[model samples]
Target: SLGTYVPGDITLVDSYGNEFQLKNLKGKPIILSPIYTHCRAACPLITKSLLKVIPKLGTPGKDFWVITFTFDPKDTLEDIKRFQKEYGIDGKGWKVVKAKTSEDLFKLLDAIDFRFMTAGNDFIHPNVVVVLSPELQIKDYIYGVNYNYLEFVNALRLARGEGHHHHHH
Candidate 1:
């Protein structure tokens, strides 16, 4: 794992078990979050907030993609699957990926400044969302759930302008 991914190098693993570097999401806005499926409080609420918020953002198939990276590497894919179903994240193109080993996990969190401290089964994590450019750069960050999807969708539209391209024809 690379040390301290600022933005561009953050890896996003998909639901189908594909690994995508942040740059791979280029050309579309990306909404990302760090949460574990097992958290007793904030995680579930955040997931609920995201579920409710995404629909308001825009048409899901077009404007952007939502990604949730589980902060717990110890949790299996089944746990992720359960989380997906519980949160109704299935049809929305949402992805939940697991990363084992604190090193890799820390590397990912460091990229986005996702600070968390664990106490037994509970975790202290920020209730936040990260917006990334189509180029995978950290475009903006929002704290708390008092947000309007239109604002985020607009930010994503603005972020789309930041993508640079390469031709391979």
Candidate 2:
């Protein structure tokens, strides 16, 4: 772990063609994941699995937020919109976004320790989901294609301080 800190500022675009500022989500918890629209291997599985957990977490844009960005900077706006439609995740709170710059995307990946490399026609990447507190601080790093429902919820709860609270008195 990187000892829990802010994941840095990130500005990207959503499938609907709108800007999404990570810093603006400062008052709401977020689930961040990386995906490549063309990946036939792990990305699809990881994305589908994450989709299943959204409904169980309560109203998306209302109760919390979810963001899945392309790990491949080459993914165009059309590709981004297509991937969103293919998944059919039109949840008002969920977004399939892309970084505006390769450098910007690299910074995000570096901050979260999400390493990826180009492999011929595809990218080799890790399957990991990052949970960020409303403050945009790293809270937990969960791995796997199929994640437990309760575990996912609890991570959000923990980030929200629903069950764990400390007093400085």
Candidate 3:
């Protein structure tokens, strides 16, 4: 059971330069993915794929949050900014963040049931999407990039039980 993670868990601190506290997101369903800015492949597609899913989600800025964080501390703000622009993060309520230390990164990875290691200039981490209820409980997980959209949204709806079948597109 995902009870291994409890409520009030602070997955991150979300400082002036970073993000923190997974539970503070208690009001919105969350879609999670792990990524490092410098990846040559999967990371970019994962971010892009999620963006494609967002507009399909109801009330993108309110009903749910799409976040991607990496375990690589070496990933820079410039790296995040560039990816943010590339993914069109502007005017959107999504978030791209990471830990600045191996310890914190490990803590996040462990909490989310994922793993990563620094290998030279590249970081190896899982390609996964974790769906959580509004109260911050793990509802479902999508392994790798090709995932189901309606199923993913259903998991979020199960968490909060609001706007379950509403749609505009």
TM-score of 2: 0.90
Superposed by TM-score, candidate 3 places the C-alpha of residue 124 at a distance from the truth, in angstroms, of: 3.3
The estimated TM-scores of all candidates read 0.78, 0.90, 0.79
lDDT, candidate 2, 52-124, per-residue tens: 8777788768877888889888898899999988998773588889987787787788878888878898887
List model 1 lDDT by residue over 1-169, tens digit each: 1112244555545555566665655667778778887787787777777778788776553778677888877777677777777776763466676654466577768778878787776887788888776666677787785667766765675566532344342
- Native-vs-model 3 lDDT? 0.68
Candidate 2 Cα errors over 4 Å, as ranges = 1-3, 6-8, 165-169
Question: 1-169, model 3: which lDDT tens digit per residue?
Answer: 3534534444553212655566666687777778877898788777777767767776654878777775567777666767677776752467776665666677667777886767787777778888777776777777777656786666676656545466653
Poorly placed runs, candidate 1 (over 4 Å):
1-12, 100-103, 162-169
Candidate 3 residue pairs that clash: 12-20, 12-21, 13-20, 14-18, 14-19, 14-20, 15-18
Span of 10 residues, lowest total lDDT, candidate 2: 1-10
Q: Pick the candidate with the highest lDDT.
A: 2
